[PDB]
C-alpha cells in the first residue's frame, strides 16, 4: 500500500527514495538511470522501487476525509 521503509533482503532504507524516484521519472530520466541516480546499485534494492505499486493514493480517494 505504501513504500516499504527497508529493502526486504539487504535492509537498506528505501523509504526516503520514493519521492525522489517519482520526481526523476516526471523528468526525462529513464527508469534504470533514475534508480542509478538514487544509488540503488544492488538488484535487491532496485526491484523494491521498480516493482512497487502505490495504492495508498487510490485507497485514500475512498477514505472519509
Amino acid at each position: 500500500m505504501i513504500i516499504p521503509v527497508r529493502c526486504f533482503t539487504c535492509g537498506k532504507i528505501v523509504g526516503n527514495k520514493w519521492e525522489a524516484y517519482l520526481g526523476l521519472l516526471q523528468a526525462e530520466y529513464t527508469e534504470g538511470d533514475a534508480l542509478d541516480a538514487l544509488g540503488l546499485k544492488r538488484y535487491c534494492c532496485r526491484r523494491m522501487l521498480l516493482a512497487h505499486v502505490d495504492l495508498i493514493e487510490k485507497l485514500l480517494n475512498y477514505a472519509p476525509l
Partner: protein
C-alpha cells in the same frame, strides 16, 4: 502487420472478458421480457366470458430502495452490501382489464422487484467516471455481472447444454441408434424422441402413454399413402428396405386414413386433468391439438397443415437409418452441437414460469370471486400481489436451486457466491462454464479435452478433483452470441434460389445433388448449388447486409447447409486471408490505434470475420503469417488469446509441462492480494490483504489487459535454487527471518461479526445493555472490558477469546444472548457499523483485524504451479551470500524442476534478473516472450554471468560453495491456507445429543473420524485392544441393562416386559449400538441379546 496485437485491446473495449455476462442481461431487460409478456398476454375468466386481462408494455426501472412508506429514493450497490439489502428495481407493467363492464387501461402498475446485475444498462454504476465511483464507494476495476441479493454478491454460472431445435442422433444403452430434438419456442418447450426398439420405428412423447408406430403418426399428419411416406424417407434400396418392417405394423392394424390414426393416437394421449377442465376436447380433437403444438413444435403448422412437420419427421427417420448401418452416431462432445446459456436465458425461463404463475393465480382469484362474492365489481388491480414475482427470483438467486416443475427443470448449483480471495478469483468466476453431465465418471467423455474447444475454452484452466473436466473457463477473445430477428436471413435465402419444400414430392431429398437448407432448425427449402448459397451468404455478411454473427455451414455427408442465428453459440474473431495475403494491410492497423476506425469498421470492411465451431470445420485457419498456404482461408488475430485469464498470469507457459499450468490456475485464485480500491470500506465475512503488494517483474500481455498490475497479489523475492539444511525435501521452502522481519509476506486477515436486534409482533424488542461494572473495581468485568457505554464494542480495542463484542438481551423477562468473540488469537476492532435492514432491525456489523507474519507451515506458490510449505526460517547470517552481498530471501530445492519439467520458472529467474538491472519489465507471453539469448546479453553488460549462475560463499562456514548457484528474483504469492487456522485438537468436549459421539467441526470443537479405511489398517496390524479403545472407550462407551429371559434392554435393573427384575444384567456397548437396537425394536426388528459371563 506488427500491430495485429492491437485488435485484442479494441475488441475487448466493447465485447469479450466479463461483457458476455452484461450484454446478456441487457437483452433480457430490454427485449426478452416483452416477448414473454406477448406470449402470456391475455388472462380470461371461466366464470365471466367478457372479463379479459391483457398486458400492453412491461418496463424494468432504475434500482431504488424505499425505507419509508412512500420515499422511493435511489440506492447504491455498496449500501446494499453493508445493510444486507437486495439491489433490485421495480417491474412496472401496463394493463387494460375489463373492470365493471368498461375497458379501463392502467399505465405503470408495479408487479414486483427484479434483481439487477452490476454494470448492466439499468445499473447506477454504468457511465460513471472514476471520481464518481468514489462517491458511490465502488472500485472502478470491478468486473460486474453479479447480483447483490440479501447482501451477498451472487454469480449465475454459464451452463452448457446440447443445442435446441436440432435433431441429435444418439445410441441408447442397447446400442439402438435413436434421435431426439428438443423444441424450444416462446410458448412450449418439449422433447420428442424416435426409437427402433424392435427393428421398427416408434415415436415417443410425454403426452402419449405408449410409443406410437411412426407410420400411424405420418397418416394422422396427412401424408396418407405408403408410397409418399417411402418416397420422403428414402428411395435407395437400403433405406426403403429397413423401413419395410415398420410399414407392416400399420398394415397389420387397420389404420388406413387420417381419422383412423388420429383416433388411435387419442386413445393413448394421457388425459391427466379431469377436474376444472369443463367438457370438451374429443379424442380425435385432442390428437389434432397434440400433432399441432406438442410434437416437433419448432416447425409451425400454417392452418393445420403438417406438410412441414411430415418432411421434418422423414429427415429424422432417414438420419436414424443411415446411422444404424455404419453406426456413425453424432458426437455429443463436439462444441458445435453444444450451446452455452448465460444469465439472460436462465432469468427468462424463471420469469416465464413466474409470470404464468402470477397470471394463473389471478385467474383463479377471478373465477372464485367474480361469480359469487357480489354485484360489486371485481377489480384485479386490487387483488394483484407484488410478492409472487419478487420473492420467486430472489430465492432462486439467493439459493442456487432451479426447480421449475412446468419445464421439468430441476437443476441446483446454478448460482455461487462471488469469491473475493483476490481480484483474479472474481474475474475467473465470471468466465466459468458448468457442464450438463455432472455424474459422469467415464474418463473419455465430457472430462476429456476436445479439439473443438480450441480458441473458445481455455485448455489448461480446470479444477483438479471431483470436476477435472466438468468445469471449464472461457478464453480471452470469445463472444457468446445472442438471439437475432431472422427476418433478413429468410429473405436473402429465398431470393438466393432456395426452392420451397412444399412444392416438391420427397423424392428430391434423396437425389445426390439436392441439399436441404435449415435455419435455426426449420427447413427453408432445397438448393441444388451449395457453394453459391455459402459463398454469396458470406460475401453479403462481410458487406454488413446480414448480421455478423449469423453462421453458414455445409455438411457434405448429410446433404444439408445450416444457417444459425440462434444465440448461445461461441464465436471468435479471425483475420480474412484472400489470395495468400492477409487483409489487415498494416495501414488499417495504424488507423485503429490513431482513432479513425474501431473494430466494427474492420468487420464491415471485410478485414475481419467471426467464425463459430461449425464454420471453423469448413475453414483452414493459419496461426502465423509464415504458415499461409493456397488453401488457407483465415489468419488468427493473436495466438496467446487461446489461454484464459488465470492461464495468462503464468510467465512462459509454453516452456512447462501442462499439468503444472493447470495447478497454477487454481493456486492463483487462492492467493492473498489487493481486492479493490474500496477494500477498506467493504465489511465482508473474510478478507485477506497483503500488506506490501508488488507488480510482477516478468509480465504477460494478458496481465496488462486484465489490469492485474493496478491491484497486484504477490511479492518479488530473491531466490537461490540450491539444496540447503535438508528442511526443504518434499516441496518445503527455506525463508530468511530478516526478510519476514523487514515485512516480506506480512498479511492482514479481516473477519466480520454480525448481530441483528429484532422487534417481535408481541412488541417486545431485543436490547443492547451497557457494560456491567463491578462496583468494587469501579471497572467493567473482564468479559465486558471492551464494550463502550452503548453496549457495542469500540473501534481500536484488542479483543481476547471469550470477550463479549455486543451485550444483547432477548426477551424470553430479558435473557442475555451475547455475541462473544471466540478467536484462538487476539483481534483489533477496526469498524463498527450500525444500520437498519430491509425490515428495520438494527443490524450491527463489526470488522476484526488480525495481522499474521509468515510462519513455519504457511503455503507459498511460485506462479509456475509449484506450491510449498515453509519448512524452516533461518537467520540472515546462516544464509549463503554472493559477492554483491545479496543473501536469498527464499531458498528453493533444485529437485522440484526435473520431475515437474518447469523450464519456464528457470527462464523467469533469468528474465527478471536482467529486467531489474536494466530497469525494464520483460514479457513472458505465451507462444512468444523474451528469448533466452537476448536476456543473457543484458546480464553480461551489467557484469553478471549470462546463464545467471552466480559464485556464492557459505554463511555457516565462510568458505566458497563448490557449485555456482542460480540466483534471481521470482514472484511468489502467499496462499490463503495458513497453519494457525488449520490447527485443531480435541480432548473431552461437546458430544452430539443424538449419538453421544464427538462433534464434526473445529468451530464446534470437532473430533477426528477414524473411518473404515483407518479401522481396516488397525485390523491388519492385529491390534484388538487399540480398536476397542479408539472406537468404544474414546468415542461412545455406554452401559445398558439386558434381561436374560427376553433379550430385551431394560432400565434400572427392571424390565417393563417380563415385569421380573431378577433376570436383568448390565452390559457394555457402544451407545450407538443401543440406538441401533432401539431403532430396530421400534421398526419391529427385534435384536434379542444373549448375555454370557466372562470366563
Amino acid at each position: 502487420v506488427e500491430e495485429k496485437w492491437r485488435l485484442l485491446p479494441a475488441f475487448l473495449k466493447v465485447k469479450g472478458l466479463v461483457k458476455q455476462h452484461i450484454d446478456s442481461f441487457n437483452y433480457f431487460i430490454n427485449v426478452e421480457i416483452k416477448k414473454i409478456m406477448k406470449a402470456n398476454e391475455k388472462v380470461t375468466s371461466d366464470a365471466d366470458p367478457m372479463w379479459y386481462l391483457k398486458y400492453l408494455n412491461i418496463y424494468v426501472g432504475l434500482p431504488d430502495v424505499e425505507e419509508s412508506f412512500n420515499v422511493t429514493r435511489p440506492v447504491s450497490p455498496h449500501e446494499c452490501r453493508l445493510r444486507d439489502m437486495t439491489y433490485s428495481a421495480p417491474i412496472t407493467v401496463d394493463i387494460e382489464y375489463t373492470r365493471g363492464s368498461q375497458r379501463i387501461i392502467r399505465n405503470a402498475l408495479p408487479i414486483g422487484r427484479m434483481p439487477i446485475m452490476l454494470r448492466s444498462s439499468n445499473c447506477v454504476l454504468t457511465g460513471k467516471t472514476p471520481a464518481e465511483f468514489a462517491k458511490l464507494n465502488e472500485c472502478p476495476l470491478d468486473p460486474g455481472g453479479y447480483f447483490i441479493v440479501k447482501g451477498v454478491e451472487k454469480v449465475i454460472l454459464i451452463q452448457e447444454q446440447l443445442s435446441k431445435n436440432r435433431i441429435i442422433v444418439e445410441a441408447d444403452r442397447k446400442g439402438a441408434v435413436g434421435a431426439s430434438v428438443t423444441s424450444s419456442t416462446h410458448e412450449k418447450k418439449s422433447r420428442t424422441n424416435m426409437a427402433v426398439k424392435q427393428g421398427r420405428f416408434y415415436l415417443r412423447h410425454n403426452t402419449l402413454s405408449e410409443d406410437i408406430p411412426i407410420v400411424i403418426i405420418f397418416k394422422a399428419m396427412g401424408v396418407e399413402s405408403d408410397q409418399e411416406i417411402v418416397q420422403m424417407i428414402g428411395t435407395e434400396e437400403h433405406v426403403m428396405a429397413a423401413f419395410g418392417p415398420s410399414l407392416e405394423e400399420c398394415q397389420k392394424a387397420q389404420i388406413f386414413t387420417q381419422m383412423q390414426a388420429l383416433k388411435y393416437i387419442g386413445n393413448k394421449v394421457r388425459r391427466q386433468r379431469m377436474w376444472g377442465g369443463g367438457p370438451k376436447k374429443t379424442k380425435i380433437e385432442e390428437a389434432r391439438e397434440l400433432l399441432a403444438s406438442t410434437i416437433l413444435t419448432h416447425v409451425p403448422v400454417k392452418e393445420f397443415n403438417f406438410r412441414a412437420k411430415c418432411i421434418y419427421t422423414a429427415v429424422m427417420v432417414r438420419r436414424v437409418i443411415l446411422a444404424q448401418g455404419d453406426n456413425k452416431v453424432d458426437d455429443r462432445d463436439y462444441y458445435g452441437n453444444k450451446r452455452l446459456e448465460l444469465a439472460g436465458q436462465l432469468l427468462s425461463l424463471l420469469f416465464e414460469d413466474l409470470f404464468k404463475k402470477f397470471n394463473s393465480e389471478m385467474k383463479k382469484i377471478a373465477d372464485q370471486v367474480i361469480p359469487k362474492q357480489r354485484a360489486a365489481q371485481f377489480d384485479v388491480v386490487k387483488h394483484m400481489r407484488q410478492d409472487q414475482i419478487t420473492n420467486g427470483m430472489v430465492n432462486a438467486i439467493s439459493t442456487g436451486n432451479w426447480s421449475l416443475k412446468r419445464f421439468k427443470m430441476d437443476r441446483q448449483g446454478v448460482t455461487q457466491v462471488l469469491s473475493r480471495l483476490s481480484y483474479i478469483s472474481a474475474l475467473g468466476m465470471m468466465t466459468r462454464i458448468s457442464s450438463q453431465f455432472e455424474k459422469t465418471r467415464k474418463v473419455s467423455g465430457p472430462r476429456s479435452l476436445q479439439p473443438s474447444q480450441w480458441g473458445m475454452l481455455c485448455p489448461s484452466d480446470t479444477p483438479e478433483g471431483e470436476a477435472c473436466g466438468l468445469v471449464k473457463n472461457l478464453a480471452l477473445m470469445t463472444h457468446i452470441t445472442t438471439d437475432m430477428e431472422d427476418g433478413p436471413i429468410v429473405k436473402l435465402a429465398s431470393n438466393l434460389g432456395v426452392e420451397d419444400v412444399n412444392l416438391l414430392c420427397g423424392e428430391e431429398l434423396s437425389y445426390p445433388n439436392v441439399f436441404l437448407v435449415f435455419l435455426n432448425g426449420n427447413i427453408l427449402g432445397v438448393i441444388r448449388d451449395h457453394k453459391k448459397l455459402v459463398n454469396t451468404f458470406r460475401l453479403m455478411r462481410r458487406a454488413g447486409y446480414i448480421n455478423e454473427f449469423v453462421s453458414i455451414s455445409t455438411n457434405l455427408t448429410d446433404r444439408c447447409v445450416y444457417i444459425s442465428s440462434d444465440g448461445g453459440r461461441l464465436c471468435r474473431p479471425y483475420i480474412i486471408v484472400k489470395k495468400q495475403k492477409p487483409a489487415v494491410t498494416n495501414k488499417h492497423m495504424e488507423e485503429l490505434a490513431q482513432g479513425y476506425r474501431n473494430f466494427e469498421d474492420f468487420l464491415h470492411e471485410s478485414l475481419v470475420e467471426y467464425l463459430d465451431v461449425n464454420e471453423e470445420n469448413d475453414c483452414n485457419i493459419a496461426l502465423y503469417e509464415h504458415t499461409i498456404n493456397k488453401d488457407t482461408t483465415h489468419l488468427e488475430i493473436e495466438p496467446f488469446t487461446l489461454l484464459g485469464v488465470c492461464a495468462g498470469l503464468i510467465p512462459y507457459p509454453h516452456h512447462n509441462q501442462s499439468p503444472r499450468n493447470t495447478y497454477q490456475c487454481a493456486m492463483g485464485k487462492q492467493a492473498m492480494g489487493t481486492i479493490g480500491y474500496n477494500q477498506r470500506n467493504r465489511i465482508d465475512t473474510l478478507m485477506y490483504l497483503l500488506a506490501y503488494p508488488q507488480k510482477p517483474m516478468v509480465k504477460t500481455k494478458t496481465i496488462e489487459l486484465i489490469e492485474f498490475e493496478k491491484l497486484p497479489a504477490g511479492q518479488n523475492a530473491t531466490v537461490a535454487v540450491m539444496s540447503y539444511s535438508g528442511y526443504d525435501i518434499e516441496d518445503a521452502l527455506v525463508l530468511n527471518k530478516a526478510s519476514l522481519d523487514r515485512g516480506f509476506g506480512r498479511c492482514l486477515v479481516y473477519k466480520n461479526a454480525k448481530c441483528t436486534l429484532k422487534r417481535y409482533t408481541n412488541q417486545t424488542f431485543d436490547k443492547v445493555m451497557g457494560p456491567m461494572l463491578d462496583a468494587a473495581t469501579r471497572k467493567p468485568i473482564w468479559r465486558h472490558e471492551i464494550l463502550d457505554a452503548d453496549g457495542i464494542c469500540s473501534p481500536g480495542e484488542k479483543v481476547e477469546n471469550k470477550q463479549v463484542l455486543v451485550n444483547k438481551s432477548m426477551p424470553t423477562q430479558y435473557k442475555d444472548v451475547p455475541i462473544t468473540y471466540k478467536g484462538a488469537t487476539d483481534s483489533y476492532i477496526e469498524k463498527v457499523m450500525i444500520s437498519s435492514n430491509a425490515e428495520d432491525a438494527f443490524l450491527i456489523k463489526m470488522l476484526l483485524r488480525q495481522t499474521r507474519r509468515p510462519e513455519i507451515g504457511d503455503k507459498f506458490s511460485s506462479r509456475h504451479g509449484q506450491k510449498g510449505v515453509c519448512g524452516l526460517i533461518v537467520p540472515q547470517e546462516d544464509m549463503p551470500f554472493c559477492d554483491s552481498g545479496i543473501c536469498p530471501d527464499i531458498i528453493m530445492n533444485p529437485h522440484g524442476f526435473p520431475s515437474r519439467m518447469t523450464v519456464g520458472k528457470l527462464i523467469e529467474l533469468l528474465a527478471g534478473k536482467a529486467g531489474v538491472l536494466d530497469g525494464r519489465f520483460h514479457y513472458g507471453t505465451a507462444f512468444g516472450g523474451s528469448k533466452v539469448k537476448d536476456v543473457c546479453e543484458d546480464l553480461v553488460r551489467h557484469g553478471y554471468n549470462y546463464l545467471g549462475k552466480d559464485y556464492v560463499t557459505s554463511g555457516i562456514t565462510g568458505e566458497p560453495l563448490e557449485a555456482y548457484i542460480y540466483f534471481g528474483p521470482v514472484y511468489y504469492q502467499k496462499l490463503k491456507h495458513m497453519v494457525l487456522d488449520k490447527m485443531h485438537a480435541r480432548a473431552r468436549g461437546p458430544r452430539a445429543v443424538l449419538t453421544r459421539q464427538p462433534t464434526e467441526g473445529r468451530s464446534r470443537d470437532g473430533g477426528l473420524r477414524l473411518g473404515e479405511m483407518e479401522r481396516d489398517c488397525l485390523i491388519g496390524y492385529g491390534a484388538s485392544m487399540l480398536l476397542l479403545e479408539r472406537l468404544m472407550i474414546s468415542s461412545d462407551a455406554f452401559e445398558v441393562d439386558v434381561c436374560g429371559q427376553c433379550g430385551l434392554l431394560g432400565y434400572s435393573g427392571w424390565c417393563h416386559y417380563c415385569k421380573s427384575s431378577c433376570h436383568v444384567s448390565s452390559l457394555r456397548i457402544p451407545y450407538a449400538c443401543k440406538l441401533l437396537f432401539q431403532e430396530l425394536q421400534s421398526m419391529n426388528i427385534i435384536p434379542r441379546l444373549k448375555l454370557s459371563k466372562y470366563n
